[PDB]
Design an enzyme around this catalytic site. Structure first.
Site, short mmCIF file in Angstrom:
data_model
loop_
_atom_site.label_atom_id
_atom_site.label_comp_id
_atom_site.label_asym_id
_atom_site.label_seq_id
_atom_site.Cartn_x
_atom_site.Cartn_y
_atom_site.Cartn_z
N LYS A 36 0.87 -1.16 0.00
CA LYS A 36 0.00 0.00 0.00
C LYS A 36 0.91 1.21 0.00
O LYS A 36 1.74 1.37 0.90
CB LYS A 36 -0.89 0.01 1.25
CG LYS A 36 -1.94 1.12 1.27
CD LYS A 36 -2.33 1.47 2.70
CE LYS A 36 -3.25 2.67 2.74
NZ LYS A 36 -2.96 3.54 3.91
N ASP A 125 -15.67 -0.92 8.92
CA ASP A 125 -16.02 -0.74 7.51
C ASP A 125 -16.00 -2.06 6.75
O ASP A 125 -15.44 -2.18 5.63
CB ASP A 125 -15.09 0.30 6.86
CG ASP A 125 -15.67 0.92 5.57
OD1 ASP A 125 -16.88 0.81 5.32
OD2 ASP A 125 -14.87 1.54 4.80
O1 LIG Z 1 -4.25 -4.81 2.56
C1 LIG Z 1 -4.66 -4.70 1.41
N1 LIG Z 1 -5.35 -3.65 0.87
C2 LIG Z 1 -5.67 -2.42 1.46
C3 LIG Z 1 -4.96 -1.91 2.56
C4 LIG Z 1 -5.26 -0.65 3.07
C5 LIG Z 1 -6.29 0.07 2.46
C6 LIG Z 1 -7.01 -0.41 1.36
C7 LIG Z 1 -6.70 -1.70 0.82
N2 LIG Z 1 -7.43 -2.28 -0.23
C8 LIG Z 1 -8.03 -1.39 -1.20
C9 LIG Z 1 -8.77 -2.13 -2.32
N3 LIG Z 1 -9.74 -3.15 -1.79
C10 LIG Z 1 -9.10 -3.99 -0.79
C11 LIG Z 1 -8.43 -3.28 0.34
C12 LIG Z 1 -4.44 -5.79 0.42
C13 LIG Z 1 -3.73 -6.91 0.74
S1 LIG Z 1 -3.70 -7.99 -0.57
C14 LIG Z 1 -4.59 -6.88 -1.50
N4 LIG Z 1 -4.99 -7.21 -2.74
N5 LIG Z 1 -4.69 -8.49 -3.23
C15 LIG Z 1 -5.33 -8.60 -4.36
C16 LIG Z 1 -6.08 -7.43 -4.65
C17 LIG Z 1 -6.89 -7.00 -5.68
C18 LIG Z 1 -7.51 -5.74 -5.66
C19 LIG Z 1 -7.27 -4.88 -4.56
C20 LIG Z 1 -6.46 -5.28 -3.50
C21 LIG Z 1 -5.86 -6.56 -3.59
N6 LIG Z 1 -4.95 -5.78 -0.87
#
Ligand SMILES: O=C(Nc1ccccc1N1CCNCC1)c1csc(-n2ncc3ccccc32)n1
EC number: 2.7.11.1
Length: 269
Positions: A36, A125
């Site tokens: 991130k 959330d």
């Molecule tokens: O910690 C994570 N994300 C994360 C961490 C902090 C804020 C937001 C996020 N995301 C934003 C988008 N939706 C999911 C949460 C994280 C760990 S793995 C990952 N991945 N892995 C595949 C993937 C595909 C689309 C978005 C995020 C994705 N995201």
């Protein structure tokens, strides 16, 4: 060793208000992790809190935190990569997904929430965009940017900050100055379950002004999305989506629910 500390950014996983999440692969081991990236110039306090909470997390249904790197004004949070992507993408519009799949994801979501509540953390959330899937379709809760402590030294603190995402938010958050944390996360889990089983959200927000919410309160279950849901999981939703948070089912009781314990066909993936 040499080079084991080098990571190559290979693709953008997502972009939004939090910044962007990229897939990074280790130069030597080929281990994949999510990163991130946040331009702290556009938080430093929010970032610190997110890291502090992440540091407490160690559970199979919660995205693991590996550490962080600060390069000038850019913050890098190294997180567990979930190749299966967002649960949101497994929900077919107007359809949902097969009941056994929804049940397995629900069991895993409960396990993660029980874990968080056990360490005194509320997510605040919960929604399909934040629930990720690994290579075996195991669910992992992500995004602790709104998370906070609700229990410390065995004393509960009431919440008052309005936050979350309207269609998922519990009604007491809109109506009351203070409220208990746990029932709010239970409620959002019930909205996630509804979405998985019907492929639609029941209301824009759980307000007296919302016709769809009124219809539910009046038990008009012959209307969508309810009509699409089998009687057994619907009976659980009747216990979760209860307006009064003090009467709402708790997780220990969800674990005793008939549908929750119904054997259905599904394995890893
Ligand atoms: O910690 C994570 N994300 C994360 C961490 C902090 C804020 C937001 C996020 N995301 C934003 C988008 N939706 C999911 C949460 C994280 C760990 S793995 C990952 N991945 N892995 C595949 C993937 C595909 C689309 C978005 C995020 C994705 N995201």
């Amino acid at each position: 060793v040499p080079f084991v500390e080098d990571w190559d950014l290979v693709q953008t996983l997502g972009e939004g208000a939090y910044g962007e999440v990229q897939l990074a692969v280790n130069r030597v081991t080929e281990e994949a992790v999510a990163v991130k990236i946040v331009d702290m110039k556009r938080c430093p306090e929010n970032i610190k809190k997110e890291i502090c909470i992440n540091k407490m997390l160690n559970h199979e249904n919660v995205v693991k935190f590996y550490g962080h790197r600060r390069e000038g004004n850019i913050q890098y949070l190294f997180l567990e990569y979930c190749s299966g992507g967002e649960l949101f993408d497994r929900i077919e519009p107007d359809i949902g997904m097969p009941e056994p799949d929804a049940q397995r994801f629900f069991h895993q979501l409960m396990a993660g929430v029980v874990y968080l509540h056990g360490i005194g953390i509320t997510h605040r959330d919960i929604k399909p965009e934040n629930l990720l899937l690994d290579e075996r379709d195991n669910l992992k809760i992500s995004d602790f940017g709104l998370a906070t402590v609700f229990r410390y030294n065995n004393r509960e603190r009431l919440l008052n900050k309005m936050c979350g995402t309207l269609p998922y938010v519990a009604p007491e958050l809109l109506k009351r100055r203070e409220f208990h944390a746990e029932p709010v996360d239970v409620w959002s889990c019930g909205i996630v379950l509804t979405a998985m089983l019907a492929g639609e959200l029941p209301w824009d927000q759980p307000s007296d002004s919302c016709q769809e919410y009124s219809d539910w309160k009046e038990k008009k279950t012959y209307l969508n999305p309810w009509k699409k849901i089998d009687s057994a999981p619907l009976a659980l939703l009747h216990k979760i989506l209860v307006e009064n948070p003090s009467a709402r089912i708790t997780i220990p009781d969800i674990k005793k629910d008939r549908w929750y314990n119904k054997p259905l066909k599904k394995g890893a993936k």
